[PDB]
Swiss-Prot record, chains A, B, C, D, E:
Keyword set includes Iron: yes
GO BP: any one term: naphthalene catabolic process
Ligand binding (Fe cation): H149, H212, E263
The protein, known as: 1,2-dihydroxynaphthalene dioxygenase
Binding of substrate, residues: H149, D196, H197, H212, Y253
Family from the record: Belongs to the extradiol ring-cleavage dioxygenase family.
InterPro entries listed in its UniProt record: Glyas_Bleomycin-R_OHBP_Dase, Glyas_Fos-R_dOase_dom, VOC, Xdiol_ring_cleave_dOase_1/2
Cofactor needs: Fe(2+)
Keyword Amino-acid biosynthesis: no
Other remarks in the entry: Encoded on an unnamed 75 kb plasmid.
Provenance organism: Pseudomonas sp. (strain C18)
């Protein structure tokens, strides 16, 4: 059955490109690639030409998520599936596909308004191995798991679930978290490969499309050094170190120059098709810096 | 689903059979088998009776590619599939099948005019283990991967892709290579088993059906010795040693007595169903000898 | 898809039960189980209550082959498949099923006239571990591979193939063996599990239903001792020690007291779905004693 | 502790070099190497320049056994050990060492009169991989196990044992075999590496220094084919196929053109330091052709 | 027994430090570390503070080899062993040890005049992971194998062998290579850990202490890219790509800015204690650029 197989790339727009270059390299160990374009640069994690496009003169938010399918037959099948179900899509011409450096490209929006791209045939620069922006003990976990995961804004969880399910994702409510005001927040997490989740959401108020992006190190030492960099440089940590009940990953959440959060992590477990839920994390992920997309403790 | 499972055998015709015997044995380590026929001999690589038929009084080009299916049910299913799709096929009688030493045989041509045979039931001489034409450290990689791969001539890539897809192959454009004249050459690569590719093509001008045949050694030492044989004997090397971005194989391309190229290699990676593309090889495969099927550098 | 999964049991009839008890125990290492019945006894190989039923006052030939399916749903599906295709079957009542010690039983004949039973739910005596009729270094290869294999008589190979294919077997002509008279004998071999073949046949003249039964030792030492027993006791060996091209097993063929052959063996390879053929065995299996079901050399 | 580590090479002399070339290649699969010397040629089994030197104008017997030590320090230590114990040795000059193609060489005789050489630094031709004299499924077992083993003549087992023990071998009486005349033959077997034995002997009357040489195939198929070659060509088999109780190897013993026996085999077990004994082999090794070094059955 | 366990560090002096920084980073992928010292900088390969010290205002040759022992007890034992055998050593004070960044240090010269240091307790910067001077697919092989190997000048091979044997190395003559003038060059290779050799030499005329330094990549792709860098930048290659008979490594030899050779390589085999010799390499290592420390082909 035709399905999305990974979060292949994403685009963000920023107001301060120079701050983003220093942040990405020094704080995270990502590689900056500048192709001489006036309005954008790239961040690499592996052999792909890029994983993140960073657009200038921007909004400090997500621009697009790029979801990969295996090839042209799955691209065509999924496109027709979306059309048959009543979703509005546009099949892109050669110029637009070349902009993203993919062989085939279609554009749509998810039910929450998040620009969503489906593509086949990423550009891989095997001649240009990843070279991190600071020394690293290891590298990033990508491969069959794609670049990482995001929590994005939604207005109707059922509608969002319908859309991502059509795309081949699996998952449902995995957390029922008590809120300070007596309500219970339901968070849904969906997978499309071995990464425990690639997309997640609730129907929570949010000023930005993007709540956080999670990037995963192969080595615990790089995660620890990254955490220390945030502390040393007095960068806000919204949720402190902890371990998630679903994916078993060791992570924290820190501010980016755009105000949405980065979640550096290590040791994510394999996705499971069998739905379960929790009322909190294993421990940690307590609130430190207030006033971010995540103001409430997870355990 | 019924599908081609390997490149089982191939036939070539040559103007100089004696030169071909010395080339195949000394330069490559293939085994010559002469069954006393006036007009042909065989080259072996493994337990199969043969992998290559070498016809005399010839054209210095490919005569046929022989694609294996698992058995009679898949043979019949694929035959009917070709007929239903409007392709012209001929089901061969016992005499023609016996000529190829197979249990069932059908003949057609691919959209580029390359004679294409589909068969089941190869003859295996378990009593006669491979005995290479020169001493070898190892042997050849065949088995589930078939004999090797070819690049062949096509006039319409989309039509070629349709035909091979019907036969059960998977793959698409994997290289977009800049050409000296400012154009971009698109090369497509298709697999039917664990070998990264078994057939590949672009819509490129070509005097011969066959651009090159790739044969894979189990041992790096045999590849190195083969490379040294080409250098020592001053045989043209069209593309020097390098590593492909798609299959990760260490290979070079040298002249055969027929003028098309042999690509001896080592360390091919497992095929992947997920389409990606590159703008060049990892490195190497630079042009040395000019005037062959490949005049342009691959990295 | 519903299919036969193993040769579960078989029945033979004999004129000399006492000779058969001594032969089975001393020459082969099978276990004799006598349940006090006037007209039969059993031979064991493993935890099954039995693998071979030996009927008295007999014909020195095969009485029935018992083919297992996984359970009742597959039994019912296969029964209906046979009926729909025009084959005559009888679904057995409780008394007949109890005679065979199975939970469900149907009876038919293959196109060559060989009585064929299909059943589910064999009786396993876990409380009664196999105890061989002579000391053994090892045991027998059974399990997922069933008891062994037989070559049986057929009058029309295509009809036989159709029947066994309906039952879920796979396989075709694997040998084209030159005969002394200038003809070529075609032998077909079919599998229904990991055993390289469980049933095989050609359209060859035969006085008996059963040409041979093959039983496989886990240990080479037991095969060698068995071979030595045949030599020491001057029991006819029709085909001497050799190795088959298809299953790679080390075997010989010796006379039983019933005149059909036993093929003791060791080291059978895993079945393959990809059809190939040979013109002889790896070596050995030359003719020694003449006048048996196999009078012609296999290599 | 300084010790012999393998049977590295051996020398034989023959009356019929041409018969020996055909025998070694066709019957055994050894590689003939002729360096243009008037009086000798070589047999190869692996990457070593050679394992067996075949001298012309000879006696149809063993000329020397060449025992390897790890290096110069062990060579010197063992030389001094032999001198201290009262054995007569000669340290060879450069010319004599070069004849054997070794870096250091000493010559002596064992207590039975068998010329015995101790050396370090064999010549290995890594550029020249083994190329068998007939097609082989596999190759030979050499490496840490050396070339094979011999039974040689002795007049005093205790004296022989003392000598080989000084050289670093371990082992003792492993067989007490009943003889037709009512006596019991004691055979001793000694190891110096993982090969179950490299040298063995009893105090038995013998016209030749060499009773037999055992060579081990990696693949059972090559052993079987070799056995079939002896049968087909009507070459005397002194002891038929069987399995040894000590090393668990499948072997037979056949005549060479020199009248002493070759023991082709397969599946030798790892040497053990713990002494045990047997009164016969597992089975087989019965007498067929009479009048050879071995006239008595082993089981 | 106390012994040297690896080539831990080395010092070189150069006339052109800027050329060396560009060469080391771009051509080899080494990491430049400048600690602000006026007269030296460092090259890193791994977590060690450094592996190579590069001194300014120099002689374009080796300054010292630094051989590690396990700890203080082995340092003291080896020091006393050298004194007892009549070698001149100096035990260094704290200032000299701190210069090398080691816990204990002694200085001597080998019999060929090559400055030789023995130390315990290297400085490891676990906080500062290796960051190569160009992007790399992999990293370097160091660890238990130390930094690499050198061939250095000697005037008396027996004396050199005595010295290195006292230090705990093992090895002897491994090559007897025919020279153009009819002589035979003997080369000796010694190991002190799993690296096939760490030091090697003959008694050959040489203008420099250092003939070559070998550095080993984990990944074949980095070796290939390095080879391509030498070709592209028209840097002299003295011996072309080939494989050594002793260590089985794929290597070539290229000019450094100091005129002695670097030998980049991949796939070195484990050292063996059993001495063997060869008359050439497996193949390759033919002469290209003349006028370097190696003017003669190795195969
Ligand atoms: C900000 C921006 C710039 C270019 C694009 O193609 C896009 O999608 C967004
Ligand atoms: C919500 C939104 C609107 C426009 C943008 O360019 C963007 O990144 C986000
Ligand atoms: C907890 C949360 C915060 C912001 C979001 O956009 C979301 O989907 C969930
Ligand atoms: C649950 C799961 C695990 C691994 C996968 O590759 C996948 O698609 C789903
Ligand atoms: C592994 C670990 C250690 C300390 C923490 O506070 C935590 O959340 C996790
Ligand atoms: C509650 C939760 C679980 C896993 C995540 O990756 C995350 O961001 C939040
Ligand atoms: C040249 C040639 C000869 C015989 C054939 O069967 C064939 O296909 C081609
Ligand atoms: C193009 C072509 C035509 C005829 C042949 O026999 C051949 O090998 C090729
Ligand atoms: C690059 C190339 C050259 C010749 C061909 O026939 C082809 O398909 C591709
Ligand atoms: C991609 C792939 C890998 C292995 C196979 O056997 C196959 O058919 C396809
Ligand atoms: C492994 C390797 C070594 C050298 C080369 O030039 C190359 O292309 C590959
Ligand atoms: C560009 C390319 C990649 C892989 C191949 O086998 C080949 O011949 C060419
Ligand atoms: C001879 C015989 C006896 C009983 C049976 O049930 C049978 O099938 C055959
Ligand atoms: C052919 C045949 C007929 C009756 C039997 O009982 C039997 O075993 C065989
Ligand atoms: C060779 C052979 C002999 C007897 C048979 O019944 C058969 O099917 C095949
Ligand atoms: C070819 C094959 C191998 C194993 C099996 O279990 C089977 O049913 C078929
Ligand atoms: C393993 C083996 C040994 C001897 C033989 O004759 C044979 O056929 C097989
Ligand atoms: C020719 C052949 C192959 C395999 C067998 O089991 C057999 O009985 C015969
Ligand atoms: C017969 C013979 C010839 C030369 C030798 O060196 C030797 O030991 C024996
Ligand atoms: C006993 C004996 C004597 C001389 C030889 O040359 C020989 O090979 C054997
Ligand atoms: C049994 C035997 C035969 C000959 C010998 O030389 C020997 O040592 C033992
Ligand atoms: C008994 C034994 C086993 C292995 C060896 O390497 C050895 O020297 C001894
Ligand atoms: C494995 C084997 C088979 C038959 C024999 O006679 C023997 O000795 C060994
Ligand atoms: C009795 C015996 C055991 C092992 C051998 O190798 C042999 O030649 C004899
Ligand atoms: C050239 C140089 C400079 C400082 C040192 O300590 C040394 O050994 C060499
Ligand atoms: C031979 C030599 C002399 C002095 C040095 O500083 C040096 O590096 C080498
Ligand atoms: C072959 C060679 C060249 C230079 C040296 O210093 C050496 O020891 C060996
Ligand atoms: C020969 C060898 C192999 C590994 C080692 O660690 C060593 O010291 C020696
Ligand atoms: C692996 C390899 C390939 C080509 C060569 O020339 C060589 O020496 C080694
Ligand atoms: C002849 C040789 C072998 C191995 C080496 O590392 C080397 O430099 C030279
Ligand atoms: Fe997250
Ligand atoms: Fe190719
Ligand atoms: Fe059989
Ligand atoms: Fe023996
Ligand atoms: Fe070297
Ligand atoms: Mg989940
Ligand atoms: Mg592909
Ligand atoms: Mg089969
Ligand atoms: Mg023993
Ligand atoms: Mg060595």
């Amino acid at each position: 059955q035709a399905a999305v197989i990974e979060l292949g790339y994403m685009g963000i727009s920023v107001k301060d490109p120079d701050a983003w270059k220093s942040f990405a390299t020094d704080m995270l160990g990502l590689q900056v690639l500048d192709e001489g374009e006036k309005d954008r640069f790239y961040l690499r994690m592996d052999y792909w030409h890029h994983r993140i496009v960073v657009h200038h003169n921007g909004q400090d938010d997500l621009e697009y998520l790029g979801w990969r399918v295996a090839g042209k037959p799955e691209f065509e099948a999924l496109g027709q599936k979306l059309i048959d179900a009543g979703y509005k899509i546009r099949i892109c011409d050669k110029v637009e596909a070349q902009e993203r450096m993919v062989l085939g490209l279609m554009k749509t929006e998810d039910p929450g308004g998040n620009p969503t791209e489906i593509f086949w045939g990423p550009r891989i620069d095997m001649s240009n191995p990843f070279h991190p922006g600071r020394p690293l003990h290891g590298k990033f976990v990508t491969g069959d798991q794609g670049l990482g995961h995001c929590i994005v804004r939604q207005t109707d969880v059922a509608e969002a679930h319908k859309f991502y399910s059509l795309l081949g994702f699996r998952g449902d409510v995995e957390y029922r978290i008590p809120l300070p005001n007596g309500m219970t927040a339901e968070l849904s997490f969906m997978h499309c490969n071995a990464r425990d989740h690639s997309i997640a959401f609730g129907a929570m108020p949010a000023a930005k499309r993007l709540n956080h992006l999670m990037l995963e190190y192969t080595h615990m030492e790089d995660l620890g050094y990254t955490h220390q960099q945030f502390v040393k440089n007095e960068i806000d940590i919204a949720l402190q170190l902890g371990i998630h009940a679903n994916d078993k990953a060791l992570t924290f959440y820190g501010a980016t120059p755009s105000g949405w959060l980065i979640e550096p992590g290590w040791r994510g477990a394999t996705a499971i098709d069998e739905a379960e839920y929790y009322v909190g994390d294993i421990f940690g992920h307590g609130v430190e810096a207030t006033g971010y997309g995540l103001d409430v403790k997870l355990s």
